[PDB]
């Protein structure tokens, strides 16, 4: 069957160093950077607990423990030794050079051994994870731009950190190893509970927690359409979808915020989160969002363009006459900023 790496908690310091080495130097290839981040998670949660989590996600993947060898290196299952050795070599070369230029005096928080380097690495992963959780498609480059602002302080400490290539590594990992989405969820839930409130942990938790709302975006926009009193919500073809609209909101009502992860998890009920069974409703919901100015750069499907345009015109006229109560809508801060151009 299929296999994947876990790393025992006894090697937490060593995997921490490897994460730091990824950030610390300008590397040619970041292919397995995301997998190293995952290895840190496994030391945090415990390798046997990871096997449980994967099994429970519906995967029969078998975990294989990381070992050590000397040329001290980590032997990580499914990660080419040449890659790990090259990351380490390039980091150590860079450190030797910089250490000498600074006469042996480099602050801890600029070194690859700084304890928050795995968390920093995982913050890039967290942004890719919340991108993935959303029912609204955005380009990877958009997310990369966001990572640059969010991790501006990390970039001052680690000015050779290659965010776009690290981002691509996490993007690929979540596409190829779907079970590691479930592992990431358990880590985020665990850290949400155990966070010391440090800067790195707080950033991770704040990004991670956005995944729930991201999954529910279109349903939240639906409520916004009603709070906007969009009269196209009364169109005959929309009223006809009442049982389907009911199924959709019954889902989130009964499940609570966890339902936001169904898209990410590729659950059989994920389509509901994208309003797949109620296309006319969806068109009014999207049109209303467009009219309010909160839809951003939406490249997704508009099932009924006439309904969309009508809903958009109506929202827009209410907006232009200052008849929208923007405080009461339940907008995100970014949506508020987009619609009103102040926060």
């Amino acid at each position: 069957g299929t296999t994947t790496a876990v790393t025992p908690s006894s090697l937490q310091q060593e995997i921490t160093l490897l994460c730091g080495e990824i950030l610390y130097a300008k590397h040619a290839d970041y292919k397995y950077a995301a997998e190293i981040g995952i290895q840190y998670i496994s030391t945090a949660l415990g390798s046997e607990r990871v096997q449980q989590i994967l099994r429970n996600s519906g995967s029969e993947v078998q975990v294989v423990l990381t070992r050590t060898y000397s040329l001290q290196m980590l032997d990580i299952h499914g990660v080419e030794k040449s890659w790990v050795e090259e990351i380490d070599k390039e980091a150590r070369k860079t450190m030797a050079t910089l250490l000498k230029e600074s006469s042996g005096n480099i602050p801890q928080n600029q070194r690859p051994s700084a304890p928050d380097t795995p968390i920093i690495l995982l913050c890039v992963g967290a942004l890719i994870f919340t991108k993935l959780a959303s029912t609204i498609e955005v380009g990877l480059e958009t997310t990369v731009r966001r990572a640059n602002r969010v991790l501006s302080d990390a970039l001052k400490r680690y000015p050779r950190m290659d965010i776009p290539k690290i981002a691509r590594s996490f993007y690929d990992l979540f596409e190829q190893k779907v079970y590691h989405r479930s592992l990431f969820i358990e880590y985020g839930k665990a850290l949400g509970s155990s966070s010391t409130g440090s800067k790195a942990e707080s950033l991770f938790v704040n990004i991670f927690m956005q995944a729930y709302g991201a999954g529910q975006t279109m349903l939240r926009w639906g409520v916004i359409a009603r709070s906007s009193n969009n009269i196209m919500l009364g169109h005959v073809s929309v009223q006809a979808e009442l049982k389907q609209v009911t199924e959709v909101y019954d889902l989130v009502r009964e499940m609570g915020p966890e339902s936001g992860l169904l898209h990410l998890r590729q659950s059989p009920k994920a389509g509901l989160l994208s309003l797949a069974n109620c296309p006319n409703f969806a068109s009014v919901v999207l049109g209303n969002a467009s009219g309010l100015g909160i839809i951003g750069m939406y490249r997704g499907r508009v099932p009924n363009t006439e309904l969309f345009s009508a809903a958009e015109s109506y929202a827009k006229s209410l907006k232009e006459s200052n008849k929208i109560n923007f405080s009461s809508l339940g907008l995100t801060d970014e949506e508020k900023e987009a619609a009103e151009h102040f926060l």
Binding site: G234, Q239, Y249, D250, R253, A310, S313
Partner: peptide
């Protein structure tokens, strides 16, 4: 975030249908 029932999101009834139809018609 508190989600209402679907029947509290849509505008149901003949009157609501006629209102939406009229607005749509006004847009040519």
């Amino acid at each position: 975030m508190s989600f209402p029932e679907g029947k509290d999101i849509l505008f149901m009834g003949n009157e609501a249908a006629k209102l939406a139809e009229a607005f749509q018609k006004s847009l040519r």
